[PDB]
Tab-separated table of C-alpha atoms and ligand atoms in Angstrom:
chain	number	residue	atom	x	y	z
A	21	UNK	CA	0.000	0.000	0.000
A	22	UNK	CA	1.024	3.609	-0.513
A	23	UNK	CA	3.405	5.319	1.837
A	24	UNK	CA	4.145	8.946	2.693
A	25	UNK	CA	6.965	10.320	4.793
A	26	UNK	CA	6.695	13.518	6.834
A	27	UNK	CA	10.180	14.936	7.582
A	28	UNK	CA	9.956	17.180	10.606
A	29	UNK	CA	13.626	18.229	10.218
A	30	UNK	CA	13.125	19.822	6.743
A	31	UNK	CA	11.507	23.171	7.611
A	32	UNK	CA	9.959	25.306	4.840
A	33	UNK	CA	7.917	28.608	5.096
A	34	UNK	CA	6.453	30.017	8.305
A	35	UNK	CA	2.651	30.330	8.002
A	36	UNK	CA	1.200	33.852	8.381
A	37	UNK	CA	-2.401	32.820	7.864
A	38	UNK	CA	-5.622	32.603	5.884
A	39	UNK	CA	-8.603	34.911	5.274
A	40	UNK	CA	-10.492	37.185	2.838
A	41	UNK	CA	-11.768	40.672	1.725
A	42	UNK	CA	-14.260	43.158	3.232
A	43	UNK	CA	-15.436	46.081	0.987
A	44	UNK	CA	-18.157	48.194	2.627
A	45	UNK	CA	-18.351	50.825	-0.180
A	46	UNK	CA	-19.000	48.342	-3.040
A	47	UNK	CA	-21.041	45.776	-1.089
A	48	UNK	CA	-22.569	45.648	2.390
A	49	UNK	CA	-20.144	45.560	5.288
A	50	UNK	CA	-19.942	42.325	7.357
A	51	UNK	CA	-22.570	42.455	10.110
A	52	UNK	CA	-21.536	42.111	13.777
A	53	UNK	CA	-22.307	38.330	13.669
A	54	UNK	CA	-20.481	37.812	10.380
A	55	UNK	CA	-17.296	39.391	11.770
A	56	UNK	CA	-17.292	36.651	14.478
A	57	UNK	CA	-18.102	33.846	12.057
A	58	UNK	CA	-15.106	34.886	9.896
A	59	UNK	CA	-12.404	35.650	12.506
A	60	UNK	CA	-13.414	33.520	15.517
A	61	UNK	CA	-12.006	29.949	15.789
A	62	UNK	CA	-14.797	28.273	17.704
A	63	UNK	CA	-17.426	25.842	16.586
A	64	UNK	CA	-18.998	26.939	13.313
A	65	UNK	CA	-16.428	29.686	12.767
A	66	UNK	CA	-13.825	29.877	9.993
A	67	UNK	CA	-10.748	30.750	12.096
A	68	UNK	CA	-9.519	33.314	9.584
A	69	UNK	CA	-6.377	35.177	10.662
A	70	UNK	CA	-5.986	37.778	7.843
A	71	UNK	CA	-8.415	40.558	6.788
A	72	UNK	CA	-7.868	42.482	3.590
A	73	UNK	CA	-9.507	45.977	3.050
A	74	UNK	CA	-9.431	48.726	0.412
A	75	UNK	CA	-7.964	52.252	0.560
A	76	UNK	CA	-10.666	54.573	-0.787
A	77	UNK	CA	-9.748	57.443	-3.134
A	78	UNK	CA	-12.233	59.646	-1.189
A	79	UNK	CA	-11.087	60.098	2.369
A	80	UNK	CA	-14.697	60.744	3.406
A	81	UNK	CA	-15.256	56.953	2.918
A	82	UNK	CA	-12.396	55.704	5.182
A	83	UNK	CA	-14.611	55.613	8.301
A	84	UNK	CA	-16.656	52.795	6.760
A	85	UNK	CA	-13.726	50.279	7.132
A	86	UNK	CA	-13.158	50.713	10.822
A	87	UNK	CA	-15.738	48.516	12.586
A	88	UNK	CA	-14.912	45.293	10.703
A	89	UNK	CA	-11.108	45.901	10.754
A	90	UNK	CA	-11.187	46.560	14.504
A	91	UNK	CA	-13.212	43.411	15.194
A	92	UNK	CA	-10.866	41.236	13.141
A	93	UNK	CA	-7.865	42.509	15.094
A	94	UNK	CA	-9.663	41.884	18.404
A	95	UNK	CA	-10.163	38.241	17.338
A	96	UNK	CA	-6.447	37.803	16.523
A	97	UNK	CA	-6.164	38.711	12.854
A	98	UNK	CA	-3.792	40.987	10.964
A	99	UNK	CA	-5.053	43.522	8.386
A	100	UNK	CA	-3.567	44.505	5.007
A	101	UNK	CA	-4.983	47.342	2.807
A	102	UNK	CA	-4.893	47.815	-0.924
A	103	UNK	CA	-5.774	50.938	-3.072
A	104	UNK	CA	-7.621	50.732	-6.396
A	105	UNK	CA	-7.244	54.404	-7.469
A	106	UNK	CA	-5.507	57.504	-6.202
A	107	UNK	CA	-7.546	60.649	-5.442
A	108	UNK	CA	-8.836	62.189	-8.676
A	109	UNK	CA	-6.700	65.304	-8.500
A	110	UNK	CA	-3.566	62.964	-8.771
A	111	UNK	CA	-4.869	60.991	-11.767
A	112	UNK	CA	-4.347	61.607	-15.427
A	113	UNK	CA	-5.714	59.723	-18.370
A	114	UNK	CA	-3.891	58.064	-21.204
A	115	UNK	CA	-4.486	55.648	-24.093
A	116	UNK	CA	-3.415	51.995	-23.339
A	117	UNK	CA	-3.244	49.379	-26.133
A	118	UNK	CA	-5.673	51.653	-28.128
A	119	UNK	CA	-8.224	52.005	-25.307
A	120	UNK	CA	-8.657	55.738	-24.295
A	121	UNK	CA	-9.435	57.397	-20.969
A	122	UNK	CA	-7.419	54.848	-18.893
A	123	UNK	CA	-6.122	55.937	-15.525
A	124	UNK	CA	-2.604	56.217	-14.231
A	125	UNK	CA	-1.010	58.057	-11.315
A	126	UNK	CA	0.590	61.341	-12.543
A	127	UNK	CA	4.364	61.003	-12.216
A	128	UNK	CA	4.555	64.484	-10.730
A	129	UNK	CA	2.155	63.273	-7.999
A	130	UNK	CA	4.118	60.137	-6.757
A	131	UNK	CA	5.078	62.044	-3.647
A	132	UNK	CA	1.485	63.225	-3.106
A	133	UNK	CA	0.326	59.557	-3.438
A	134	UNK	CA	2.723	58.486	-0.705
A	135	UNK	CA	1.132	61.169	1.462
A	136	UNK	CA	-2.350	59.819	0.662
A	137	UNK	CA	-1.321	56.229	1.645
A	138	UNK	CA	0.354	57.539	4.770
A	139	UNK	CA	-2.781	59.613	5.631
A	140	UNK	CA	-4.774	56.293	5.414
A	141	UNK	CA	-2.255	54.457	7.566
A	142	UNK	CA	-2.427	57.283	10.166
A	143	UNK	CA	-6.249	57.476	10.000
A	144	UNK	CA	-6.586	53.732	10.619
A	145	UNK	CA	-3.949	53.843	13.415
A	146	UNK	CA	-5.901	56.668	15.113
A	147	UNK	CA	-8.939	54.310	14.977
A	148	UNK	CA	-7.194	51.255	16.502
A	149	UNK	CA	-6.265	49.543	13.303
A	150	UNK	CA	-2.466	49.031	13.013
A	151	UNK	CA	-2.123	47.808	9.426
A	152	UNK	CA	0.329	44.887	8.910
A	153	UNK	CA	0.935	46.098	5.338
A	154	UNK	CA	-0.269	48.482	2.600
A	155	UNK	CA	-0.083	47.788	-1.117
A	156	UNK	CA	1.049	50.165	-3.889
A	157	UNK	CA	-1.812	48.971	-6.104
A	158	UNK	CA	-4.382	46.232	-6.501
A	159	UNK	CA	-3.825	44.457	-9.801
A	160	UNK	CA	-1.734	47.129	-11.569
A	161	UNK	CA	-1.695	44.752	-14.585
A	162	UNK	CA	-5.475	44.245	-14.794
A	163	UNK	CA	-6.726	47.853	-14.318
A	164	UNK	CA	-9.390	48.342	-16.982
A	165	UNK	CA	-11.660	49.620	-14.155
A	166	UNK	CA	-9.027	51.245	-11.951
A	167	UNK	CA	-5.400	52.556	-12.095
A	168	UNK	CA	-2.772	50.920	-14.298
A	169	UNK	CA	0.951	50.692	-13.508
A	170	UNK	CA	3.483	49.307	-15.925
A	171	UNK	CA	6.283	47.107	-14.522
A	172	UNK	CA	8.611	50.104	-14.916
A	173	UNK	CA	6.229	52.604	-13.219
A	174	UNK	CA	5.822	50.112	-10.359
A	175	UNK	CA	9.609	49.692	-10.214
A	176	UNK	CA	10.287	53.474	-10.174
A	177	UNK	CA	7.721	53.949	-7.394
A	178	UNK	CA	9.255	51.022	-5.426
A	179	UNK	CA	12.771	52.305	-5.962
A	180	UNK	CA	12.274	56.076	-5.525
A	181	UNK	CA	9.158	56.550	-3.299
A	182	UNK	CA	8.109	53.406	-1.417
A	183	UNK	CA	10.765	53.921	1.256
A	184	UNK	CA	8.639	56.889	2.495
A	185	UNK	CA	5.607	54.706	3.261
A	186	UNK	CA	5.094	54.337	6.978
A	187	UNK	CA	4.109	50.665	6.915
A	188	UNK	CA	5.259	47.322	5.408
A	189	UNK	CA	5.071	47.676	1.643
A	190	UNK	CA	3.306	45.010	-0.387
A	191	UNK	CA	3.770	44.787	-4.119
A	192	UNK	CA	2.904	44.235	-6.862
A	193	UNK	CA	-0.329	42.201	-6.484
A	194	UNK	CA	-0.316	40.962	-10.055
A	195	UNK	CA	-3.712	39.485	-10.928
A	196	UNK	CA	-2.134	36.128	-11.973
A	197	UNK	CA	1.295	36.100	-10.222
A	198	UNK	CA	2.894	37.336	-13.413
A	199	UNK	CA	6.661	37.418	-12.811
A	200	UNK	CA	7.174	40.375	-15.149
A	201	UNK	CA	5.519	42.665	-12.546
A	202	UNK	CA	7.738	41.426	-9.704
A	203	UNK	CA	11.094	40.500	-11.363
A	204	UNK	CA	12.144	44.248	-11.641
A	205	UNK	CA	11.628	44.784	-7.923
A	206	UNK	CA	13.610	41.614	-6.979
A	207	UNK	CA	16.463	42.548	-9.311
A	208	UNK	CA	16.908	46.192	-8.154
A	209	UNK	CA	18.619	46.475	-4.764
A	210	UNK	CA	16.841	49.725	-3.728
A	211	UNK	CA	13.402	48.535	-4.744
A	212	UNK	CA	13.968	45.129	-3.105
A	213	UNK	CA	15.079	46.865	0.051
A	214	UNK	CA	11.838	48.946	0.066
A	215	UNK	CA	9.716	45.813	-0.408
A	216	UNK	CA	8.479	43.862	2.597
A	217	UNK	CA	5.844	41.491	1.189
A	218	UNK	CA	5.714	40.054	-2.287
A	219	UNK	CA	1.960	39.944	-2.881
A	220	UNK	CA	0.328	37.980	-5.719
A	221	UNK	CA	-3.200	37.028	-6.828
A	222	UNK	CA	-4.023	33.563	-8.249
A	223	UNK	CA	-6.677	34.266	-10.969
A	224	UNK	CA	-5.816	31.732	-13.634
A	225	UNK	CA	-2.466	30.778	-11.998
A	226	UNK	CA	-1.434	27.151	-12.820
A	227	UNK	CA	0.628	24.801	-10.621
A	228	UNK	CA	3.665	25.126	-12.885
A	229	UNK	CA	3.565	28.963	-12.279
A	230	UNK	CA	3.483	28.685	-8.513
A	231	UNK	CA	7.203	28.143	-7.872
A	232	UNK	CA	9.345	31.317	-8.171
A	233	UNK	CA	13.071	30.591	-8.371
A	234	UNK	CA	14.036	34.320	-8.367
A	235	UNK	CA	12.188	34.842	-5.145
A	236	UNK	CA	13.897	31.736	-3.624
A	237	UNK	CA	17.268	33.340	-4.645
A	238	UNK	CA	16.562	37.065	-3.742
A	239	UNK	CA	13.718	36.938	-1.282
A	240	UNK	CA	15.530	36.553	2.005
A	241	UNK	CA	13.672	38.534	4.724
A	242	UNK	CA	10.611	39.134	2.490
A	243	UNK	CA	7.231	37.524	3.009
A	244	UNK	CA	5.222	35.836	0.292
A	245	UNK	CA	1.409	36.293	0.333
A	246	UNK	CA	-1.366	35.175	-1.975
A	247	UNK	CA	-3.760	38.143	-1.413
A	248	UNK	CA	-6.781	37.447	-3.592
A	249	UNK	CA	-8.517	34.673	-5.411
A	250	UNK	CA	-11.752	32.796	-5.826
A	251	UNK	CA	-11.810	29.241	-7.204
A	252	UNK	CA	-12.870	27.498	-9.283
A	253	UNK	CA	-15.360	30.285	-10.339
A	254	UNK	CA	-17.570	33.158	-9.066
A	255	UNK	CA	-20.815	31.533	-10.224
A	256	UNK	CA	-23.953	32.819	-8.419
A	257	UNK	CA	-24.966	30.565	-5.559
A	258	UNK	CA	-22.067	28.084	-6.161
A	259	UNK	CA	-20.462	27.910	-2.740
A	260	UNK	CA	-21.994	24.525	-1.637
A	261	UNK	CA	-21.446	22.687	-4.982
A	262	UNK	CA	-19.699	19.263	-4.462
A	263	UNK	CA	-17.187	17.960	-5.451
A	264	UNK	CA	-16.337	21.362	-7.038
A	265	UNK	CA	-15.546	22.762	-3.602
A	266	UNK	CA	-12.554	20.290	-3.318
A	267	UNK	CA	-10.780	22.651	-5.804
A	268	UNK	CA	-10.518	25.233	-3.028
A	269	UNK	CA	-8.528	22.734	-0.841
A	270	UNK	CA	-6.412	21.680	-3.739
A	271	UNK	CA	-5.580	25.371	-4.600
A	272	UNK	CA	-4.584	25.995	-1.015
A	273	UNK	CA	-2.423	22.793	-0.914
A	274	UNK	CA	-0.771	23.990	-4.117
A	275	UNK	CA	-0.223	27.534	-2.787
A	276	UNK	CA	1.483	26.067	0.291
A	277	UNK	CA	3.499	23.178	-1.172
A	278	UNK	CA	4.252	24.289	-4.765
A	279	UNK	CA	4.334	28.062	-4.136
A	280	UNK	CA	5.719	28.134	-0.592
A	281	UNK	CA	3.092	30.845	0.204
A	282	UNK	CA	2.804	32.082	3.769
A	283	UNK	CA	-0.739	33.583	3.438
A	284	UNK	CA	-3.776	32.652	1.362
A	285	UNK	CA	-6.577	35.310	1.157
A	286	UNK	CA	-9.903	34.941	-0.598
A	287	UNK	CA	-11.901	37.730	-2.312
A	288	UNK	CA	-15.180	38.807	-0.602
A	289	UNK	CA	-15.652	36.790	2.602
A	290	UNK	CA	-19.480	36.994	2.378
A	291	UNK	CA	-20.815	36.246	-1.113
A	292	UNK	CA	-22.843	33.536	-2.864
A	293	UNK	CA	-19.539	31.911	-4.175
A	294	UNK	CA	-17.458	32.658	-1.087
A	295	UNK	CA	-16.552	30.925	2.164
A	296	UNK	CA	-19.522	32.603	3.925
A	297	UNK	CA	-22.974	32.471	2.337
A	298	UNK	CA	-25.333	35.524	2.228
A	299	UNK	CA	-27.231	33.928	5.094
A	300	UNK	CA	-24.113	34.076	7.281
A	301	UNK	CA	-23.441	30.289	7.360
A	302	UNK	CA	-20.269	28.562	6.214
A	303	UNK	CA	-20.256	27.089	2.717
A	304	UNK	CA	-18.562	23.902	1.468
A	305	UNK	CA	-15.868	26.220	0.024
A	306	UNK	CA	-15.579	27.732	3.469
A	307	UNK	CA	-15.088	24.291	5.080
A	308	UNK	CA	-12.296	23.597	2.601
A	309	UNK	CA	-10.556	26.775	3.797
A	310	UNK	CA	-11.295	25.831	7.380
A	311	UNK	CA	-9.363	22.500	7.089
A	312	UNK	CA	-6.276	24.762	6.908
A	313	UNK	CA	-7.342	27.963	8.705
A	314	UNK	CA	-8.748	26.387	11.879
A	315	UNK	CA	-5.755	24.054	12.442
A	316	UNK	CA	-2.588	25.436	10.730
A	317	UNK	CA	-2.260	28.528	12.949
A	318	UNK	CA	0.006	31.569	12.388
A	319	UNK	CA	3.655	30.705	13.267
A	320	UNK	CA	3.436	26.974	12.409
A	321	UNK	CA	6.089	26.045	9.886
A	322	UNK	CA	5.455	23.920	6.816
A	323	UNK	CA	7.758	20.835	6.615
A	324	UNK	CA	8.775	18.612	3.713
A	325	UNK	CA	6.368	15.703	3.215
A	326	UNK	CA	5.434	13.347	0.408
A	327	UNK	CA	3.063	15.742	-1.439
A	328	UNK	CA	1.233	13.275	-3.663
A	329	UNK	CA	1.733	9.690	-2.225
A	330	UNK	CA	-0.762	8.013	-4.541
A	331	UNK	CA	-2.925	9.166	-7.465
A	332	UNK	CA	-5.567	11.818	-6.352
A	333	UNK	CA	-4.190	12.080	-2.790
A	334	UNK	CA	-2.432	15.290	-1.684
A	335	UNK	CA	-0.682	15.767	1.628
A	336	UNK	CA	0.789	18.795	3.359
A	337	UNK	CA	2.193	18.947	6.882
A	338	UNK	CA	3.026	21.814	9.251
A	339	UNK	CA	4.789	21.605	12.575
A	340	UNK	CA	4.139	23.583	15.744
A	341	UNK	CA	7.643	24.348	16.961
A	342	UNK	CA	6.429	24.825	20.522
A	343	UNK	CA	6.027	21.001	20.894
A	344	UNK	CA	6.954	19.361	17.588
A	345	UNK	CA	3.299	18.380	17.014
A	346	UNK	CA	2.206	17.973	13.437
A	347	UNK	CA	-0.875	19.038	11.470
A	348	UNK	CA	-1.322	17.070	8.260
A	349	UNK	CA	-4.063	18.031	5.702
A	350	UNK	CA	-4.784	15.191	3.291
A	351	UNK	CA	-7.080	15.595	0.347
A	352	UNK	CA	-8.549	12.516	-1.335
A	353	UNK	CA	-10.132	13.554	-4.645
A	354	UNK	CA	-10.672	9.832	-5.557
A	355	UNK	CA	-14.070	8.281	-5.780
A	356	UNK	CA	-12.593	5.270	-3.834
A	357	UNK	CA	-11.158	4.985	-0.352
A	358	UNK	CA	-7.354	5.087	-0.041
A	359	UNK	CA	-5.181	3.415	2.655
A	360	UNK	CA	-1.776	5.058	3.220
A	361	UNK	CA	1.057	4.318	5.712
A	362	UNK	CA	2.251	7.768	6.907
A	363	UNK	CA	5.766	7.491	8.356
A	364	UNK	CA	6.856	10.327	10.680
A	365	UNK	CA	10.430	9.197	11.607
A	366	UNK	CA	11.774	10.431	14.929
A	367	UNK	CA	8.406	11.697	16.204
A	368	UNK	CA	7.324	11.010	19.768
A	369	UNK	CA	3.639	11.450	18.672
A	370	UNK	CA	1.670	8.156	18.893
A	371	UNK	CA	-1.940	9.291	18.418
A	372	UNK	CA	-3.625	11.532	15.831
A	373	UNK	CA	-7.148	12.919	15.958
A	374	UNK	CA	-8.943	13.492	12.682
A	375	UNK	CA	-11.656	15.778	11.261
A	376	UNK	CA	-13.273	14.924	7.958
A	377	UNK	CA	-15.351	16.913	5.363
A	378	UNK	CA	-17.139	15.130	2.539
A	379	UNK	CA	-20.235	15.980	0.517
A	380	UNK	CA	-22.412	14.779	3.417
A	381	UNK	CA	-20.589	16.088	6.574
A	382	UNK	CA	-18.511	19.091	7.621
A	383	UNK	CA	-15.462	18.823	9.870
A	384	UNK	CA	-16.779	15.588	11.425
A	385	UNK	CA	-14.608	14.192	14.211
A	386	UNK	CA	-13.772	10.535	13.387
A	387	UNK	CA	-11.916	7.743	15.309
A	388	UNK	CA	-8.362	8.401	16.541
A	389	UNK	CA	-5.339	6.892	14.629
A	390	UNK	CA	-2.865	4.879	16.823
A	391	UNK	CA	0.664	4.626	15.493
A	392	UNK	CA	2.722	1.418	15.319
A	393	UNK	CA	6.077	2.986	16.211
A	394	UNK	CA	6.474	6.043	13.972
A	395	UNK	CA	4.062	4.799	11.240
A	396	UNK	CA	0.346	5.896	11.184
A	397	UNK	CA	-1.845	3.769	8.777
A	398	UNK	CA	-4.862	5.968	7.635
A	399	UNK	CA	-7.898	5.120	5.397
A	400	UNK	CA	-9.215	8.208	3.569
A	401	UNK	CA	-12.907	8.230	2.592
A	402	UNK	CA	-13.699	8.966	-1.027
A	403	UNK	CA	-13.849	12.720	-2.006
A	404	UNK	CA	-12.760	14.046	1.331
A	405	UNK	CA	-10.471	16.334	3.180
A	406	UNK	CA	-9.012	15.090	6.400
A	407	UNK	CA	-7.053	17.124	8.887
A	408	UNK	CA	-4.929	15.032	11.290
A	409	UNK	CA	-3.918	16.818	14.502
B	501	LIG	O1	-17.363	51.532	-10.498
B	501	LIG	C1	-17.297	50.458	-9.543
B	501	LIG	C2	-16.856	49.160	-10.197
B	501	LIG	O2	-15.466	49.193	-10.578
B	501	LIG	C3	-17.046	47.972	-9.261
B	501	LIG	O3	-16.852	46.812	-10.055
B	501	LIG	C4	-16.055	45.855	-9.373
B	501	LIG	C5	-14.685	45.755	-10.010
B	501	LIG	O4	-13.950	44.775	-9.300
B	501	LIG	C6	-14.526	43.483	-9.434
B	501	LIG	O5	-13.712	42.493	-8.807
B	501	LIG	C7	-15.899	43.489	-8.778
B	501	LIG	O6	-16.474	42.211	-8.975
B	501	LIG	C8	-16.759	44.523	-9.462
B	501	LIG	O7	-18.056	44.633	-8.876
B	501	LIG	O8	-18.340	47.876	-8.666
B	501	LIG	C9	-18.774	49.055	-8.012
B	501	LIG	C10	-18.669	50.282	-8.907
B	501	LIG	O9	-18.937	51.423	-8.088
B	502	LIG	O1	-12.279	39.652	-11.408
B	502	LIG	C1	-11.138	39.505	-12.274
B	502	LIG	C2	-11.179	38.116	-12.877
B	502	LIG	O2	-12.325	38.031	-13.734
B	502	LIG	C3	-9.921	37.870	-13.688
B	502	LIG	O3	-9.994	36.542	-14.209
B	502	LIG	C4	-8.842	36.046	-14.906
B	502	LIG	C5	-8.629	36.765	-16.248
B	502	LIG	O4	-7.523	36.168	-16.952
B	502	LIG	C6	-7.724	34.789	-17.262
B	502	LIG	O5	-6.576	34.308	-17.964
B	502	LIG	C7	-7.940	33.964	-15.986
B	502	LIG	O6	-8.275	32.613	-16.333
B	502	LIG	C8	-9.059	34.546	-15.127
B	502	LIG	O7	-9.125	33.839	-13.879
B	502	LIG	O8	-8.806	38.030	-12.804
B	502	LIG	C9	-8.635	39.352	-12.316
B	502	LIG	C10	-9.840	39.765	-11.501
B	502	LIG	O9	-9.760	41.157	-11.189
């Protein structure tokens, strides 16, 4: 039968966390109850540890972000903010690829834009929200409906201005993790020095485009965050569809194991295709996220483990360095049960608990696994995610 090895001595990326977006200008804010469902880690709560928000172009809208951002922080989360457009007096229009009236930040206003981002940072700080990071731009390379930045404009801002931002600087938030938006920053010593978090979105991003050798070479001291996605679609009322929801778990496994990502952040938290339904309950897509978010907590470290021990079975493992305990998340996308011997050499652990989601149950506690020495034999139900803790 199939075997996997978890190697607790081969440490990979430190986990920062998991979460999603609030946008109270475009859609309704989270309600009081929804804030707790998202950021609490009790029964029937998602255990999210990252909130993302927008930086409005009109400072008279900033007050609308405060209640949800404050609640998330109270429940243990960190908050990152991204702008879509500068204030209109800083914007000029230009023609891009033949399309007129497109927006870019006026070059002669780069310093004024820093002051706008800093004014947001200071406004949120005055209201009890200490931002973990602020982005230069949401999707500078997909800005048909907002503000475009070329790779060079992004680079010049990163090199010449981003040092003046009073927060961690996240860039470039390419819509698809396109390396042409980030390579210039990683290759310029001043820009790289001004960077703190390499942020990327995953819209259309394949497994082969998840590794990033340049970042493994140049990225020492920088974090690596996947700051927006929905998968496998944004279809109306799709969030409970099965086995489609297993794609959410698989995308997260891939982000962690193939991309070495430290954070994975959904789009709108509350939406008919999101982790929280419009009625405030958790969706099947939400339970997929929860198999990671509720158990792989911030500061756990991913470790090397057999990622794909048999066809349609995917394994990731994270270690809590406080006690060398292990959290393993195993996805079985097969329509048949799979029996695996999981070897964890040199562990003192002899018993694992397990929680299982299928099409018919959500995070169901099942019977404990007893090890024979350092080997744990596990049977995975068909079309399931199991978290072993
Ligand atoms: O003018 C604003 C639009 O730009 C906005 O459209 C959003 C663009 O980002 C997409 O990810 C959203 O799905 C889409 O709704 O909507 C509000 C409007 O004021
Ligand atoms: O809301 C937008 C998405 O609709 C957009 O979707 C991607 C566009 O490029 C395609 O190659 C991808 O398959 C698709 O996921 O991503 C950006 C986002 O703002």
